[PDB]
């Protein structure tokens, strides 16, 4: 006697509230970087939707399992280890496109571990990247 509609409304409702609280943790500096990265990763997504889908295809992104998501992480990190700003903005877009594709399957734990560990490796030697997004204007 469980209502499919209510459960998923309550879950989404709380998560939405949890995102807002993560947003207030972003500061003037981080809020602007966000908006600047937003614009870059969006423009990448139109032209390289053709190109990024092919990567989403090579990496079997429908596998939705740690055994594979762990491999997706390793492979993405391997590409960074072999790391200029342009590639970094492209990795972010790739992940956004993995989210777009697997967003209906729901939130799963491995992806979070992936999003954090990749977000982490990208932060390495941020200096070269900060310049890229801030020579826009």
């Amino acid at each position: 006697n469980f209502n499919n509609s209510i459960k998923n409304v309550i879950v989404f409702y709380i998560n939405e509230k949890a995102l807002i609280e993560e947003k207030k943790m972003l500061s003037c500096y981080e809020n602007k970087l966000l908006n600047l990265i937003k614009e870059d990763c969006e423009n990448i997504m139109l032209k390289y939707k053709p190109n990024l889908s092919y990567i989403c295809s090579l990496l079997k992104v429908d596998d939705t399992s740690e055994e594979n998501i762990k491999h997706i992480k390793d492979q993405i990190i391997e590409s960074l280890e072999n790391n200029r700003p342009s590639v970094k903005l492209a990795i972010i877009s790739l992940i956004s496109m993995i989210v777009e594709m697997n967003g209906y399957k729901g939130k799963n734990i491995p992806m979070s571990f992936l999003i954090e560990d990749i977000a982490l490796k990208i932060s390495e030697n941020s200096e070269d990247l900060i310049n890229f997004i801030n020579i826009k204007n």
Binding site: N51, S79, A90, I91
Partner: peptide, 22 residues
């Protein structure tokens, strides 16, 4: 199974190239 690994890094290398000029 290494061929899929190569093309992914190869395909990312193009996106960064095109994106460095513009």
């Amino acid at each position: 199974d290494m061929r899929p690994e190569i093309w992914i890094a190869q395909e990312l290398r193009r996106i960064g190239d095109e994106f460095n000029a513009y």
